[PDB]
Every structure is written in structure tokens, then in C-alpha cells.
């Protein structure tokens, strides 16, 4: 490390002492230092109790660390400047050991500015305690085609819709298939040829709607995280679509 000292007036021996005292702080800086300068001045007025003024500037990897002290002589000023610079460099570290106690920790305990925001679902929580099923629509079970079902979707502003298919005579549910288009799920999977003709670009889910109970359906919805579950009820034997409502209850659509 190389230091330049720009003294002023009569300060014999201050330059060497300041050089050798400040150059020892290179190991303290955790990043390479560049062009570290020091300046010594003396107050002309004898009325000042601490006439000597010392200033130091270091460029630690682009970060400017500067300090300034007053003293009665060159030696005291240089020593105080060294202590001040050491404290500043300690507060500057920014390496992991010095930035590990401020990084957000745990999952829910403690909150910080950069702590990860809580993931909130669209629905009101309404935990399993008194969740209940307080919405049961049975809008339409008149047979429809894919295009007619899509239009019945669109003006209802509902992502999924349960109807009964024209060609099959079976219950089916359409939903937005994402970027792939739309997706159709039937109680028993059938190919497109048996399905009534359509013009919208859709795809058919190959899996069949399984048979399961109400509590099992709620458990599957909870452990599978889908926006809804379409299934054949075990007791009823017919189609059913459960979705988490906008109040936290489950919306069971039945024929």
C-alpha cells in the first residue's frame, strides 16, 4: 500500500509517522484500497486548544472512506485519525460475516424491510374450522357443444364451467388451458371424434374424473392446491365440482 501525505506549514516528522501508521490499515480493509491520501494542517491562531487537524481519505474498491480529527500535536492527531479510520472500515466491511445478522431469517418470525412478503391466496382464509360449503350453483345441465359451452363461459366471467356434453351425454367441465388454449375434462375420457364438432382450439385431459367422498374431496383439494376439483361423488354417483369460494368456503356445484 502506498500513501501520499500533503502536509502544510511546519510539521517535521509528521509525514513519516502518518505514512507508517496509516499504511498498516490495508489488511483491515476487506477489499483492495486505491490512492489513499492524508493531509495535515496546523491552525495559525494559538487560541485553539487542539490546533493540528488531520484528514484522511481512502478509496476501498470504489467506496470512499474519509475521516477527520483534531489534536494538540502531529502524533496524537495521527493516532486518533488511525482509530477513526479503523472504526469506519469496520463499519464498511459489507462482506458476509458483517452482513449475515441483517439478512432476514426464519419463515414467519421477525419482519424486515426486505423480508419476503407473505403469500396470500385470492380467497379469504376462513380456516378448515367452520369452512363449510355455502354456495351450491346448478346453473345449466341442458346439453351443449364445446363452442356453446365456451360462450356460456365467457359472459359468466368464470374460469371453469361444468355442463353436460352434446355428443357424449356425459358431464364435462371446461376451463382455460392457459397458453395451450382451453382444456376439457370428462367423467369418462373420450376422443375428439365422439365429442361434438368444435372450432375453438382445445385439448382433452386424458385422466378420468375419479370417485371419492366429500371429505376426501376436500382433502384432495387442500393437498393438491388446484383452483377446483372435478369428481364423481361416491354417494351421489354423479358429477361435482368443488372450488374454494371468495369467502373461504367451498363451492360445490351439483346437478
Amino acid at each position: 500500500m502506498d500513501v501520499d501525505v500533503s502536509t502544510d506549514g511546519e510539521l517535521p516528522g509528521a509525514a513519516e509517522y502518518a505514512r507508517e501508521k496509516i499504511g498498516r490499515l490495508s489488511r483491515r480493509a476487506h477489499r483492495p484500497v486505491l490512492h489513499a491520501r492524508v493531509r495535515l494542517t496546523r491552525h495559525g491562531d494559538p487560541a485553539v486548544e487542539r490546533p493540528v487537524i488531520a484528514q484522511a481519505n481512502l478509496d476501498v474498491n470504489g467506496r470512499q472512506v474519509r475521516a477527520q480529527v483534531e489534536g494538540v500535536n502531529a502524533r496524537e492527531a495521527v493516532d486518533r485519525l488511525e482509530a477513526r479510520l479503523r472504526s469506519r472500515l469496520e463499519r464498511i466491511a459489507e462482506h458476509w460475516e458483517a452482513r449475515r445478522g441483517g439478512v432476514p431469517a426464519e419463515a414467519g418470525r421477525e419482519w424486515r424491510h426486505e423480508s419476503e412478503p407473505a403469500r396470500r391466496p385470492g380467497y379469504f382464509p376462513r380456516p378448515p374450522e367452520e369452512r363449510r360449503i355455502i354456495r351450491r350453483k346448478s346453473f345449466s345441465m341442458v346439453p351443449c357443444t364445446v363452442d356453446e359451452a365456451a360462450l356460456e363461459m365467457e359472459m359468466l366471467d368464470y374460469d371453469f364451467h361444468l355442463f353436460t356434453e352434446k355428443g357424449t351425454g356425459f358431464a364435462a367441465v371446461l376451463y382455460k388451458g392457459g397458453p395451450t388454449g382451453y382444456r376439457l375434462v370428462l367423467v369418462i375420457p373420450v376422443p375428439a371424434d365422439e365429442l361434438s364438432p368444435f372450432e375453438k382450439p382445445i385439448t382433452i385431459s386424458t385422466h378420468p374424473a375419479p370417485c371419492l367422498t366429500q371429505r376426501d374431496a376436500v382433502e384432495r383439494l387442500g393437498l393438491l392446491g388446484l383452483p377446483f376439483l372435478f369428481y364423481i361423488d361416491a354417494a351421489e354417483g354423479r358429477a361435482s365440482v368443488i372450488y374454494r369460494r371468495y369467502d373461504g368456503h367451498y363451492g360445490l356445484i351439483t346437478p
Binding site: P210, L212, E219, R220, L223
Partner: peptide
């Protein structure tokens, strides 16, 4: 969540889910 979704998506039918 993604494990069960991928199990379904690879053509494997899912019978029941148990935690």
C-alpha cells in the same frame, strides 16, 4: 404441489392423496 402435479402430468393416474 408440483410433485403431485407432475405425477399426474406424466400420464400416471392418481388414485388418492394421503398426508
Amino acid at each position: 404441489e408440483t410433485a403431485i402435479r407432475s405425477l399426474q402430468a406424466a400420464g400416471l393416474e392418481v388414485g388418492t392423496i394421503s398426508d
